[PDB]
């Protein structure tokens, strides 16, 4: 890879520069290079990896939705035939999004997940695995859609089992995992009652554990608890 000649520390240093410059494709490429050095990632380095690819795939998903909406309207009754261009370009963006997802899943499979023994690292990577299979599922329409959905579900479920046994209910990673697994239930698995039940139980069990936390930890946990509340308000 193009980053094979650059020191691991320099890749991490430049990933942070890219974030400051809002150059998230660069940031993701630097962090991919860092992962491919073969050493495990620190807490800070894991969050650099997730931030970079979250932003890249976030822009692709927003673009795919714009184009998908245009495509759907073009297939309504009374809509003028405009040729293959809308579908072609939606497919282009879709293929690039799928490529980003495959890249992340490849990093997790080779070999981040298998070397992650601590709960904080293992849960973090399994959440990521669930997230990027979810993003594949958002655009899936074929014969592998059900297996893609189950791959997201299975990764989320293993992460949930570990986090409930090994982390306190206010842990930001545990909270963000539960937030996203709830979103999976609502937006992917057609299970809104499961999504609502999970978000409520997660919020309540975190509320009851806030008294154990410092001011700084309290701020982190309540920030993510508010996202659970936002979704419950949106959904009810």
């Amino acid at each position: 890879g193009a980053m094979g000649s650059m020191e691991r520390a320099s890749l991490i240093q430049k990933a942070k520069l890219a974030e400051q410059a809002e150059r998230y494709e660069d940031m993701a490429a630097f962090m991919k290079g860092a992962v491919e050095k073969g050493e495990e990632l620190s807490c800070e380095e894991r969050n650099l990896l997730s931030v970079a690819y979250k932003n890249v795939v976030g822009g692709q998903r927003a673009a795919w939705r714009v184009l998908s909406s245009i495509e759907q309207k073009s297939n309504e009754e009374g809509s003028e035939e405009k040729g293959p261009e809308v579908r072609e370009y939606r497919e282009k963006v879709e293929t690039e999004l799928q490529g980003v997802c495959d890249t992340v899943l490849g990093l997790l499979d080779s070999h981040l997940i298998k070397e992650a023994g601590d709960a904080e690292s293992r849960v973090f990577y399994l959440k990521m695995k669930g997230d990027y299979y979810r993003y594949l599922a958002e655009v899936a329409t074929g014969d592998d859609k059900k297996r893609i959905i189950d791959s997201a579900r299975s990764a989320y479920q293993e992460a949930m089992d570990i986090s409930k046994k090994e982390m306190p209910p206010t842990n930001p990673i545990r909270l963000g995992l539960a937030l996203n697994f709830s979103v999976f239930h609502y937006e992917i698995a057609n299970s809104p009652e499961e999504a609502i039940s999970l978000a409520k139980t997660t919020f309540d069990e975190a509320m009851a554990d806030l008294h154990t936390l410092s001011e700084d930890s309290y701020k982190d946990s309540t920030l993510i608890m508010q996202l659970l509340r936002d979704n419950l308000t949106l959904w009810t």
Binding site: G176, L177, L179, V183, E187, I224, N231, L234, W235
Partner: peptide
């Protein structure tokens, strides 16, 4: 119906 928040 809108997109939900995620982490």
């Amino acid at each position: 119906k809108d997109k939900a928040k995620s982490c």
